[PDB]
Design a binder for this molecule. Structure first.
Ligand SMILES: CNc1cc(N2CCOCC2)nc(N)n1
Length: 154
């Protein structure tokens, strides 16, 4: 049993866009933009929708860069997160009720205030490598097990 999620990182040559989640799941942490995939939309449609809802941004093209599966102890559904990246965006990021966006220089990524798994796979993202990851969480702070490998096809 799994549920589809999206995560979108706007990565430009010297900077990456992150949003500070202000309520709900993962509140109080920086992350890319995204969320649940709905019935009746493709995964990529969902990524675009969440990007627009959370930042006002639209994009020309989204590129598949990763897939990460999360298990939370005691929770029946696995989280199947499809991770996308893009360089060219359309518009200027604006704050939503969900997210407060900011640009970060690539050597100033706030890992201590991000999901812990990001510390493991974000470098691969910045190095433009495609990846498959798995992280087992107890609660929201503790990684119990994980696997991470580069792949050819996401
Ligand atoms: C559990 N560690 C997570 C979860 C997550 N999510 C973003 C998309 O919605 C599903 C949860 N994003 C990151 N970077 N790490």
């Amino acid at each position: 049993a799994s549920r589809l999620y999206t995560l979108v990182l706007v990565l430009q040559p010297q900077r990456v866009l992150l949003g500070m989640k202000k309520r709900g799941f993962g509140a109080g942490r920086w992350n890319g933009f995204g969320g649940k995939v709905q019935e009746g939309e493709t995964i990529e449609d969902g990524a675009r929708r969440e990007l627009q809802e959370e930042s006002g941004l639209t994009v020309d093209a989204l590129h598949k860069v990763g897939q990460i599966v999360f298990e939370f102890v005691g929770e029946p559904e696995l989280m199947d997160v499809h991770v996308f990246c893009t360089d060219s965006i359309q518009g200027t990021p604006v704050e939503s009720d969900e997210m407060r966006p900011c640009w970060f220089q690539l050597d100033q990524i706030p890992f201590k205030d991000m999901w812990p798994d990001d510390s493991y796979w974000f470098p691969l993202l910045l190095q433009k490598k495609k990846f498959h990851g798995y992280f087992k969480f107890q609660g929201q702070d503790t990684i119990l097990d994980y696997t991470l490998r580069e792949v050819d096809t996401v």
